[PDB]
């Protein structure tokens, strides 16, 4: 994560492995725009969904 | 039933997609996909008559009239 | 989650025992197992096409 | 299907090219127009 | 030129789009490929060559 001001330009990271997954039993680089759809899970990204 | 989407069935008869009940398009036979969640009713494609009805913003002072309140043909809002 | 279906495995039979044929461009999970007393079950990420 | 020659042609600008690709499709099940054409990859690439 | 459906939009979701891409081809040793969009380049608004 960065801030790009020029001035305000620091950053900061952190040794994270995230490797790609794949919901159900075939990998997938992206969703299929057909196929079966599978209970899976995501973030809700409504800001104001609580974790 | 029990279905594979996991999702509400309306009186179609068939499992079908829930966030369809808020994306703008109406699926169901029934007038569902607008009953339970919140909704942009003007994209920014749209037209905001003063009452908040939405319709096309190309019918907005185009010719004739479309919302309850006219505000599509409106004169002074053209 | 939309996931895909690798193509529909063609079989072929012979006496006690078939042979799946296998294409999936992604790696694929393929599982099978028999239903009698001992499960035998197996498993194998296949990739690409083969039998 | 999937071995050499899955497409076969008397000459590259032939009209009576025939196959076998084993190509199927299913029902077009999601909300937007697509047809989901589903086959063994190209038995000339296994060959390849 | 039209507008078409490609899997994976800008956002991470199937989306109707002009720029669809349709096929992609990489048998040239160069490495390079040849894309085929919906979007027409090198056309005028009337289908005047413009580049
Ligand atoms: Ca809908
Ligand atoms: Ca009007």
Redesign the interface.
Known sequence: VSITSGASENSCTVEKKIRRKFVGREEYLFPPVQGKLVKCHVYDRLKETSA | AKCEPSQFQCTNGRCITLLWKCDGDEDCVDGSDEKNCVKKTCAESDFVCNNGQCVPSRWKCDGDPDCEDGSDESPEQC | ????????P?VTKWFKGITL?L???????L?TRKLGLRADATAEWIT??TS | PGAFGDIQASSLDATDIVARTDIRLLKPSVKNIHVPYTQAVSGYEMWK | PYLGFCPYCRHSAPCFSPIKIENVWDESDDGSIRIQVSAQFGYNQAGTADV
């Not at chain 3, 989650?1 to 529909?8: D, I």
Request: charged share 5%; proline share 15%.
């Open positions: 989650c939309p996931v895909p279906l690798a193509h529909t063609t044929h294409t999936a461009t992604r790696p694929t999970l599982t690409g096409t």
